[PDB]
Each structure stands twice: as structure tokens, then as C-alpha cells.
Amino acid sequence: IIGGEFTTIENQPWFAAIYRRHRGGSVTYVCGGSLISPCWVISATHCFIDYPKKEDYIVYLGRSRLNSNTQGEMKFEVENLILHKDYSADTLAHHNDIALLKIRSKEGRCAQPSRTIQTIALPSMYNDPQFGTSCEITGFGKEQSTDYLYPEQLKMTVVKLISHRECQQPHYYGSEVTTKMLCAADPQWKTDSCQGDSGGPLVCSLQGRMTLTGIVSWGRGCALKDKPGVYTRVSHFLPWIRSHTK
Ligand SMILES: N=C(N)c1ccc2cc([C@@H]3O[C@H]3c3ccccc3)ccc2c1
Missing domain, CATH: 2.40.10.10 (Trypsin-like serine proteases)
Structure with missing residues (x-):
């Protein structure tokens, strides 16, 4: 993180x-x-x-x-x-x-x-939070892309969900990101998941219930401008x- x-x-x-x-x-x-x-x-x-x-x-x-x-x-x-x-x-x-x-x-x-x-509760079918919703991520992944060691203490952060239409923009990921994938990032590109955080949860509070909306999957670099974290769409x-x- x-x-x-x-x-x-x-x-x-x-x-x-x-x-x-x-x-x-x-x-x-x-x-x-x-x-x-x-x-x-x-x-x-x-x-x-x-x-x-x-x-x-x-x-x-x-x-x-x-x-x-x-x-x-x-x-x-x-x-x-x-x-x-x-x-x-x-x-x-x-x-x-x-x-x-x-x-x-x-x-x-x-x-x-x-x-x-x-x-952690699973989502119901066709029920994901709206774009712009804040969700949390957790992991032992790199604190900086140039680090080779992982942090000793567990870390968390909060990121916002990005729509499929925005994530498919040319300076984002184009057609490389599919409807079975969910994008999330910091609007200021300062905080994100990184190598070592893969497989970990993307948890969203949805209609009052904490839900496993995503699984950390991939991204271009870490906390890079216009390069959101990409998550397996659990639903x-x-x-x-x-x-x-x-
Ligand atoms: N920008 C991100 N949120 C993000 C999210 C997950 C990542 C995961 C990796 C994994 O190290 C990559 C990898 C690729 C192919 C096979 C194994 C590991 C690297 C950068 C990553 C970056």
C-alpha cells in the first residue's frame, strides 16, 4: 500500500x-x-x-x-x-x-x-456500489514502487470507485480493462495498492453492509497518474x- x-x-x-x-x-x-x-x-x-x-x-x-x-x-x-x-x-x-x-x-x-x-459478506448479483463511492483496501504490499522489502506492519487506505467508461479512456487502460473488472484510485494519485497487495480485499460499505466488492488484481505501476488499481469484480x-x- x-x-x-x-x-x-x-x-x-x-x-x-x-x-x-x-x-x-x-x-x-x-x-x-x-x-x-x-x-x-x-x-x-x-x-x-x-x-x-x-x-x-x-x-x-x-x-x-x-x-x-x-x-x-x-x-x-x-x-x-x-x-x-x-x-x-x-x-x-x-x-x-x-x-x-x-x-x-x-x-x-x-x-x-x-x-x-x-x-466478509459477498455482494448480491448485479449489485455494485455507484462510481465515486469510497472503498478500503488492505495489505502487506510495497510502500513505494522502488522498495524491494515489504512493510512489517499491515497497512490500509481508502480509494474511490471509477466507472467502466472512465477506465476505458485512452490515457487510462482503453479496451484492456473489461466489464468483469473494476477500477479504483485516489483522485490525487498519492495512495494505491501495489505489488504484494494482490489477492487482497477491496471492501465497500454498500446499503449499510461491509461487502467484498473486489480482489486486488493489476495496475500500471503504483499510484501513477491515470493508472487506477484494477480489481476482479466479485459480483x-x-x-x-x-x-x-x-
Ligand atoms: N497500481 C495498482 N493498484 C497495482 C495493483 C496490483 C499490482 C500487482 C503487481 C504484481 O507484480 C505483478 C505481477 C504480474 C504478473 C504475475 C505476478 C505478479 C504489480 C503492480 C500492481 C499495481
Whole structure:
């Protein structure tokens, strides 16, 4: 997250921190994710497509720092790694950038809801917030595009939703951004998601309910003028989410 504020997991309790174990035992941060039901974390396929072995992944819930075992946190392995069958990557745009991770503790259990571990509501079909609505994003991604390290403390920011017609403008993304994608950014281009924030939530308060409207997917650079963050439009994928979580 470029700009924004440092926060803690009690403010983002649906946030999942996803890591990968390498041969030799080293563990590194991969991407963010969101808890949609006790057994299911939703994220982005581009985070896993090059290493599609479910055994390689570690998922944390209730974790506030990158290298701290936060009080109340829960650690899980991935029982099922479900990647969207028609995923593809263009120079910038990712297509069907959505993945499901069925999680399980070493005891074979799903998440135990608490003050720091909570699910996030899914949207209803054809019901997204209007353009201009403020939504929040969270993650452990880069604070600056030139950084190679990620921040130790979890960060959040607030961005505004941008219409499909505005995002398809020539100085924005043209026809590279589709109707299955949602754009959001800072009108002053000072705050945004960045590399490392992929798979994490775009949460919008809609008709009084906090909703998982988007999943961090792609963007040209980070907090670059006329280059919004692009998010998987969760409402389009409700039949795919319901069928793959059954
Ligand atoms: N401007 C943004 N909001 C934004 C949002 C998500 C991003 C995600 C990346 C990921 O590093 C890119 C990548 C591409 C292809 C495969 C894996 C990772 C880089 C820049 C990103 C920028």
C-alpha cells in the first residue's frame, strides 16, 4: 500500500496473509486474501499460477505483522487450491484473476471466528456500489514502487470507485480493462495498492453492509497518474464462487 495508514488485524478481521515455503525451509510472503466462510479464503489466481502446488502454501488469519506471531492468530494449510480454468495474462491485464483456497489447521479444522478473525459478506448479483463511492483496501504490499522489502506492519487506505467508461479512456487502460473488472484510485494519485497487495480485499460499505466488492488484481505501476488499481469484480463471479465452494 502506497500512502494510507498503518493498521492492525482487529480493524481488517477478514484479511488473510498468504505465504509460500521454498525448498530448504525459507518462508516468504506471497499475497493477500479474504475470508468468505470459515473454510474458504478467496484470492487472485496470478499469485499461485506459477507454483500451483497447494502443499507449498501457509495461510494466516488474525495476523497484524509480517514477521510477528500476533496474539489470537490462526495458521492453516491449503486443502484445495482452486484456480479459475480460463485465467490468462496479457501485458498488463489478468483475466478471471480469482482463486479459492480451502483452508485447514493441522487438526483438520476451519477458521474459528473471533474479535480478530471474521468473514466478509459477498455482494448480491448485479449489485455494485455507484462510481465515486469510497472503498478500503488492505495489505502487506510495497510502500513505494522502488522498495524491494515489504512493510512489517499491515497497512490500509481508502480509494474511490471509477466507472467502466472512465477506465476505458485512452490515457487510462482503453479496451484492456473489461466489464468483469473494476477500477479504483485516489483522485490525487498519492495512495494505491501495489505489488504484494494482490489477492487482497477491496471492501465497500454498500446499503449499510461491509461487502467484498473486489480482489486486488493489476495496475500500471503504483499510484501513477491515470493508472487506477484494477480489481476482479466479485459480483460477476458469484455462480463460479457458489459452485466451487459447494
Ligand atoms: N497500481 C495498482 N493498484 C497495482 C495493483 C496490483 C499490482 C500487482 C503487481 C504484481 O507484480 C505483478 C505481477 C504480474 C504478473 C504475475 C505476478 C505478479 C504489480 C503492480 C500492481 C499495481
